[PDB]
Each structure stands twice: as structure tokens, then as C-alpha cells.
């Protein structure tokens, strides 16, 4: 739904994520789990990590963040043509992990906050708008697949 110009801002900012994917992943998950503690309960792997120092010390959580941001980066680089990338993600998050669509909204907010905190200069108003639109499109298409799956 984005313009080419907006996609360029999305991908330009994502290149900075890729310069420290693991660090971005940790910051995003710490923000998600501290702001929305109920999400922490859906991560059986991590629900025992109840302090910020405890999540930061978890190499398992650090590895998961890379997995997550690697999949998200692959989706964003498709500039909306991400049917095949979203299919297995919707399938697992709807029917295996049982993640409400609202939690993807919480994670999207956390991504935006971390990008702004690490890259306040490059993640200005226009890049923030483009990245919000890209994540909104991701959530819309995931929600449509949830419905196809019966969830």
C-alpha cells in the first residue's frame, strides 16, 4: 500500500537494524515484555525472565530476536509481495503459539520505539510514517491469514 519512496525509507532504516540485529532484537523484546507483561506469558521459553537484567543476560532470548528480525526483514524487503513469507508465520502464530493479533501490534510499537531510540536522526517523521505503514500492512495481511486458518 506504500509508495516506492516510502519503501526506500523502510529498507534504508532496516539496513541499520542489520548492523546489529541481535542488539535490536534484545531491545525490542525487553520493551515488549516490560510494557506488556501478558506477552511474556505467551513465550514459555522466556516467561521466567521477569527483570530487564534477566532478559538482557539470556543468550537464548538474544538468539530468538535474531530469528524474529531476520524473518521480519525478509518480509519487508518484499515491499508488500510477501504472501509466501507470511504463510508459515501466520500458521504457527495462530495455531501453534496462539498469539493474538493485538500482540503483533504491541511488538510493532516496540520496533518503532527501538528504531527511534537507536537512530533518532535517520528515523525521522517520514521514516517513522513509512515504517508504521509497513508494519500495519504486515499485521493486516497476517490477520487475514488468521481468518483463513479459523482463528
**Is residue 119 a known part of a binding site?**
no
- Least separation in angstroms between residue 104's CB and ligand HEM is 5
Answer for the pair 59, 112: CB distance below 8 angstroms, yes or no.
Answer: no
* Closer Cβ to ligand HEM, 96 or 121, answer by number: 96
| Whole-Å CA distances, 42 to 24, 56, 73, 123 | 21, 18, 23, 30
CB 74 to ligand HEM: min, Å: 9
| Binding test (CB under 6 A) with ligand HEM, winner from 104, 130, 131, 134 | 104
Q: According to CB under 6 A, which one of 8, 16, 23, 42 is a site residue for ligand HEM?
A: 42
Q: Residue 69's closest CA among 27, 31, 34?
A: 27
Spatial distance between the Cα atoms of 128 and 134, rounded to a whole number of angstroms: 10
Residue whose CB is less far from ligand HEM, 48 or 97: 97
- How many angstroms separate the CA atoms of 18 and 76, rounded? 13
- Mark the binding-site residues for nitrite, compressed into ranges: 64
Binding site for ligand HEM (CB under 6 A): 39, 42-43, 45, 67-68, 71-72, 88-89, 92-93, 97, 99, 103-104, 107
Amino acid at each position: 500500500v506504500l509508495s516506492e519512496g516510502e519503501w526506500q525509507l523502510v529498507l534504508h532504516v532496516w539496513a541499520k537494524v542489520e548492523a546489529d540485529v541481535a542488539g535490536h532484537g534484545q531491545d525490542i523484546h525487553i520493551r515488549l515484555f516490560k510494557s506488556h507483561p501478558e506477552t511474556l506469558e505467551k513465550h514459555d521459553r522466556f516467561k521466567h525472565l521477569k527483570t530487564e537484567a534477566e532478559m538482557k543476560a539470556s543468550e537464548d532470548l538474544k538468539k530468538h530476536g535474531v530469528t524474529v528480525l531476520t524473518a521480519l526483514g525478509a518480509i519487508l524487503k518484499k515491499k508488500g509481495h510477501h504472501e509466501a513469507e507470511l504463510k508459515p508465520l501466520a500458521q504457527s502464530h495462530a495455531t501453534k503459539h496462539k498469539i493474538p493479533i493485538k500482540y503483533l501490534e504491541f511488538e510493532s510499537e516496540a520496533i518503532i520505539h527501538v528504531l527511534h531510540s537507536r537512530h533518532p536522526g535517520d528515523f525521522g517523521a517520514d521514516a517513522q510514517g513509512a515504517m508504521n505503514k509497513a508494519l500495519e500492512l504486515f499485521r493486516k495481511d497476517i490477520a487475514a491469514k488468521y481468518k483463513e486458518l479459523g482463528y
